[PDB]
């Protein structure tokens, strides 16, 4: 999985262990190995939501599978709770988009994922 978390909160408000903890959280929720998870954090960014500059997170989650409609209820519950706990954001200020990828559309270790599997 490839995750991007952007927030208008300043960088000082996104704890140093945010990425590590989110990695563990998503490994469990998505049934994915921790070593296959990348997390980008972009803090101190201009973001509005309904034209408001109040604290908000906008998140993208890409993965080959593990993103069924049922799965995504679980990931949204967990990611949202995680952001509430760590970033102190309200539930309605965590916006997540999921991208369900084909293995022919991911490059890693110098070739596509499809080319490295059965």
């Amino acid at each position: 999985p490839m995750v991007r978390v952007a927030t208008n909160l300043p960088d000082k408000d996104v704890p140093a262990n945010f990425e590590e903890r989110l990695t563990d959280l998503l490994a469990e929720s998505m049934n994915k190995p921790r070593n296959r998870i990348a997390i980008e954090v972009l803090a101190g960014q201009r973001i509005t939501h309904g034209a408001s500059r109040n604290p908000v997170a906008v998140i993208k989650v890409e993965s080959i599978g593990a993103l069924s409609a049922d799965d995504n209820i679980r990931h949204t519950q967990k990611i949202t709770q995680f952001c509430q706990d760590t970033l102190k954001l309200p539930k309605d200020k965590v916006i997540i988009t999921y991208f369900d990828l084909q293995p022919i559309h991911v490059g890693f270790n110098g070739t596509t994922v499809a080319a490295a599997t059965m």
Copy 2:
């Protein structure tokens, strides 16, 4: 809708009301509520286009629906004109990608959009 505007123009050149005005513009063009629209602005960024560092904007627009081929002619006309007016970019220096999302692939308010609707 979730919108990301990246530009190599410095932040001082992206007016404070850019996000608010773009929100109103997209609410009208896309027939979406203003409160359902998030806008990220990333200025002062390294971007080339045809290898040139001239002023350019690269924009992503995600939405559940409202992105038919006909709709996207309208949004492109409006977003481009908006960027010409506010950022003083030429028409051929505004690049937009549209992502038409399923409601099972968006998390908001702690669950998926699909789980919150009829």
Copy 3:
């Protein structure tokens, strides 16, 4: 094509000609005109991969076509080698996601790509 390269390497480690050279590389690999290629570079960014803060690049490549499973083996080989050469990253620290776009989903020069073609 619209390319985004994010790295936790500092900006000083991403050479000034990175974007120009990547443009030439992708023009050849993808059989696309250089003038149709935009490259965003975001360096000095927080990124972890398997919870590690070691040097890594996370890359997105969007294009109308030119992204067949066979094509993507080639682009991944070339982009990865390019990042090894210029950014001194290990092969297993270059992560790429491909997005194969419809022409109705790209705006350029004030209208959609579909509206400008045959």
